[PDB]
Amino acid sequence: NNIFNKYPTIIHGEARGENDEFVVHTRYPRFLARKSFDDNFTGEMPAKPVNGELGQIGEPRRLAYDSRLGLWLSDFIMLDNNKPKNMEDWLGQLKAACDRIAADDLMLN
Amino acid sequence: KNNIFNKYPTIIHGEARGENDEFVVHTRYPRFLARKSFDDNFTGEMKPVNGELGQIGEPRRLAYDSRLGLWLSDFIMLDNNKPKNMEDWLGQLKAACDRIAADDLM
Amino acid sequence: KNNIFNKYPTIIHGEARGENDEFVVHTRYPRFLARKSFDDNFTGEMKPVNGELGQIGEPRRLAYDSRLGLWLSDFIMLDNNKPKNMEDWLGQLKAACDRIAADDLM
Amino acid sequence: NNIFNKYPTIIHGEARGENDEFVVHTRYPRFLARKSFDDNFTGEMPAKPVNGELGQIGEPRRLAYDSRLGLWLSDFIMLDNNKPKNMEDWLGQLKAACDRIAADDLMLN
């Protein structure tokens, strides 16, 4: 409810005995995601704002965000109850949140 | 969402830019998001953790006191299961807090 | 069941053969079944009711103290709505108890 | 859960400014019902054990128990979550509970 807005928008996460990291987005659309990094990740801010892409990968096909910078978000768990009135609209907002989270992780110093 | 949480580690310790407090997600029952807070004189070394749930202060909110310097508050429940029996429900919420408290002393 | 409760009066005061304590059903949010208990020196005449929720005694259970002689305990929640925000949830549970307390002084 | 079994099996209810009464059954099958009385109700124990009947009445058709003694139970709200494996089996157990509640109301003195 209002209660999520007591929290910061982006929470960056970590668990013991785990190499992947974690993120919580507390504004709409709200979610818990797994944050991972591949070989093309270096951690530095790119010249142009983060412009990732979000799509289905793996078998079975599950939604994934690729920052195109080596940072991935995956295993999304939606924390709101709502059915999006428009899927493309909802996908667009999820991606914007994801770009913001990716950019936030790089500024995390 | 009932079981998707099980792909996640039980306890996720979190942080946020510009914030002093910390954050936890508990991904087993009962699942929740909470704020991690700390006393000034919080040592961190180690009887097993026996905290307690309570409504503290005059802000009228539910907090958890580890009694070892760590607090959990602003509890957001994430499960979809209705708990009729409150008996399990606060006890298990306090039991999970005692685990988050131990796991964070590290 | 989400709304069928609305065909019922908000507060149902109950009794049972062979039992000293009494019983209440609250049929609006938050909906619950509870046990009504009484101090020995409970007068019953009448500031509006401002009780408090608490975990009392060493039995580790959630009770409500009207502070006017009436208690509610053994809370069984009956709603099907998940309350993420605990902030409303205990406050409203305590607000409903303050109403059951006033309504039973009669 | 176990928590219902802290309560007595049958709770007889009343509300302010209401003429109908109310009942909670705390054993399986668990429910909240409205308890009403018609003109053939006198309140005394009949010679043979209560043998009511349970059926659909009104428009729309909603489940009702008639004690055949003037006591009715209606507006059932089921308090358990389960789907009965067998409807006739479940109906049978609901009626037995209802006979027991009816008989309990008469002994309530």
Author numbering:
A (entry chain A), D (entry chain A): 5 to 113
B (entry chain B), C (entry chain B): 4 to 49, 52 to 111
Authors' text:
To better understand the precise mechanism by which AcrIIC2Nme inhibits Cas9 activity, we determined its crystal structure to a resolution of 2.5 Å using single-wavelength anomalous diffraction (SAD). Consistent with these previous observations, AcrIIC2Nme shares no sequence or structural similarity with previously characterized anti-CRISPR proteins. We also created a mutant lacking the final 12 amino acids (Δ112–123), which were not resolved in one of the apo crystal structures. The crystal structure of AcrIIC2Nme revealed a highly negatively charged surface that binds to the positively charged bridge helix. Mutation of this electronegative surface decreases the affinity of AcrIIC2Nme for Cas9, resulting in loss of anti-CRISPR activity. To determine if the interactions between AcrIIC2Nme and the bridge helix of Nme1Cas9 are required and sufficient for anti-CRISPR inhibitory activity, we mutated 19 residues distributed widely across the surface of AcrIIC2Nme. Mutation of three of the four amino acids that make direct contacts with the bridge helix (E17A, E24A, D108A) displayed a complete lack of anti-CRISPR activity in vivo while the other mutants showed changes in activity of less than 10-fold. Circular dichroism spectroscopy of the three mutants with abrogated in vivo activity revealed spectra similar to the wild type protein, showing that the lack of activity was not due to a folding defect. In addition, cooperative thermal denaturation curves and melting temperatures similar to the wild type protein indicated that these mutants maintained stable, folded structures. We conclude that the negatively charged surface of AcrIIC2Nme and the positively charged Nme1Cas9 bridge helix comprise a critical interaction interface that is required for anti-CRISPR activity.
